[PDB]
Design a protein around this ligand. Sequence first.
Ligand SMILES: COc1ccc2sc(N)nc2c1
Length: 171
Amino acid sequence: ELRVGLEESELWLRFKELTNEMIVTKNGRRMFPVLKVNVSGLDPNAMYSFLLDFVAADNHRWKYVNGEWVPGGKPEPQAPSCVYIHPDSPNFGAHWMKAPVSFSKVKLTNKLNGGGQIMLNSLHKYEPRIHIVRVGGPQRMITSHCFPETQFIAVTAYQNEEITALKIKYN
Ligand SMILES: COc1ccc2sc(N)nc2c1
């Protein structure tokens, strides 16, 4: 059975209990913490690509009012985010299972851009999600996994200084 787990869930949970924030910039900003995933139960000889996308967790714009994040009253449909391909892709099951799969090079932007960078909606809340795609084989297969512990609001600057302090303490 294919098992997907979050590495350093302890740390992620401390961010989550404060309401996590990730910076987005025109050129794109790397994530901290980095999403790192433990995977077991792949066919070590089979070929797979690791994909990352961001689900809009709700349909609302958020705003930091009197030191607390509060959702707007005017929800709108959220266009799904683009997919980031893990740069080790495609790769053997053995490669993916030998160490945590680390998305250290994904960049989050607020502007439609050349390539690599993933555009997100400013002040919307996101739940990171991966897709494990079996490739090259005759029978294509996809397993998806969400990481609620890794939820965050996309911001152009940090609102809650508790988040800023944790980002610095652990980086
Ligand atoms: C996934 O990134 C985006 C960026 C801007 C907008 S406005 C809208 N309706 N949804 C989105 C999603």
